[PDB]
């Protein structure tokens, strides 16, 4: 499902969304703020700001082979996904994301941590640092997408941030990001900047403007009258969400069995230890089955799907209703009311999905 | 307020838990599983297993002399902290902890690092090592009080793990551990063992009962005759919590003005960015005021204690709730109920607490 078409925005139906633990290229979601450049190949060149006052310049050619290539496998969840179950408490503003803004893929490319090592900089700064980057896409008055990360997240090996240029071993889709993309596990996908120009490390964060102001969590009182981004952090590490993409809304299901599917997923590295299903509208609880396989601790950049399968009597009515839990145990809420916020974000409260068993 | 005198277990009352940011010695909550072992300090030594067989034998002396000393102001929460809330809702085995089961300290220690990487240990190894921890309390059949963490958390200079022999200045006393204790900041106060006697380094994780077989969460639907411990994790990280401790149930505050008055912290270093206050049982919300120094990122060991000064209208009755919210945007779940497990552990719904203002 298409919600923008200039600038473009794709989430991939429930029916497919969680059918493979790999997205294919074709079917994960796109978020575009700007147009989408055509990057000619043999003239770009990834700058890289030196500690002194330096410049990498990077070929393509050369990021590819002057550095290891690492694969890592790494869930991106937009941090408007799920964005209409709060536009349903209270009006928001942004674009309607259901349950798909979130996909999967093993991704290839250089170590953020080698290219800055190799550029001059060191393993640790005193103080908090930011590592910038900047996208090639542009508004008309020339101002780039852009975002950071914290200099001890860009350095640290364990959290496996990346400067990919393949996805699902190809290289990546111009809508991804080619040819050259940050990907950064565990965090909102604000900040896997696409198009990479230029990789900064700043004694400030980006002063962009989803860096800045944008992408941020409030109280539910706040409004547009009184929001000030500079009461909260900027959305790194996301919380612990899961979702049911089968059955469908509204569906009516034959009786005998029922095999309930969905994801789950946390931020930071966390992995899901446990996703609760429920079929009477949050009651009583049935443990789910989760498909995967472990991932080191703390490097839990993938979604787990799940399923159950249940028995399900003739002519009743369910609320299957999911919740996960994560290994910091770390839960999702009830309602969404409470964790409701003018831009529609960070909507992590129980997924609720009502269908009807046939007679 | 003691819960239990033999073995030992007492909370500080509620109206002195948050009137400093570290809490006194001899207030900080107690939790003895065991009998409290008396030490002689000229004597006790630490012995610290090699990794080709060497022993390493530590005296109180050396520990403080050849390892520098580090000093981390951390917060332990009991996993059973808030319990009888849950119990509540549906009886739980455990001590009926209210919300007191948390308490702060400057520690003053050895680190963990510093004694593994002179003892002969990697920075790293392959695969899921663990750091096991053994007290000088002990079961009639003589099994002493353990915990483990992993290999990963022991050797991480940003972790903070201390080998702590100071708390608060003082040496520690004798319900703390004296002469020596493990202080993990930002996980479960089960795995700060006191009375420390060994420390190990196992490919397999404590086989202490409160590391196999207690203290871990499981869905609601889990009964005594279902539970395994076997599909849980060992709980190391907290998620997050908060509390009002002022005022109390019950009151009839003096109208015009009040002032509510809690904590509030994550496990895992995580700082709490916000902190909702409700008067109306959780139908309005306002931001309370986060009192305390920041931390460095992903290094907020210590809670952090919140006010609201909120003027109040005489003959009102109000519903005081807190919610708050993590550097990774993680929140608190509406109610007990959906997070209940049989243990009574990992109590973190929100707080609720009635009052009136005199007429
Ligand atoms: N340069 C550039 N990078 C960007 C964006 C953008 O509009 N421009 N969108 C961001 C955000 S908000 C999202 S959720 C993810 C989505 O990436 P995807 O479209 O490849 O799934 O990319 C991020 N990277
Ligand atoms: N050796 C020893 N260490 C232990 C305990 C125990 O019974 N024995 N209890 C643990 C748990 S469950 C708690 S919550 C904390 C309590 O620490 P405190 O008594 O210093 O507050 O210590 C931990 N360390
Ligand atoms: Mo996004
Ligand atoms: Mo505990």
Known sequence: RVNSQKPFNAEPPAELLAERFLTPNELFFTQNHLPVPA???????????????????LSLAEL???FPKHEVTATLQCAGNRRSEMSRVRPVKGLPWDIGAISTARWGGARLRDVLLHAGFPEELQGEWHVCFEGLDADPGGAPYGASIPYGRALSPAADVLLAYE??????????????????????????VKWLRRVAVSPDES?????????????PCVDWDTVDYRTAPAIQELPVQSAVTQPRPGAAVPPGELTVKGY????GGREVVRVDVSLDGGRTWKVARLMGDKAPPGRAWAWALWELTVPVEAGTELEIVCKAVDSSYNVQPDSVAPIWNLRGVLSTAWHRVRVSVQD
């Open 39 to 57: 990057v000619e190949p043999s003239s770009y060149r990834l700058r890289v700001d030196g500690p002194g006052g330096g410049t990498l310049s």
């Open 64 to 66: 590819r082979s002057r």
């Open 167 to 192: 996805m699902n071993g190809t290289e990546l889709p111009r809508d991804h990001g080619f040819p050259v993309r940050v990907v950064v596990p565990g965090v909102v996908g604000a900040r896997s």
């Open 207 to 219: 002063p962009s403007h989803w860096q800045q102001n944008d992408y941020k969590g409030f109280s």
């Open 264 to 267: 789950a997923w946390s931020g």
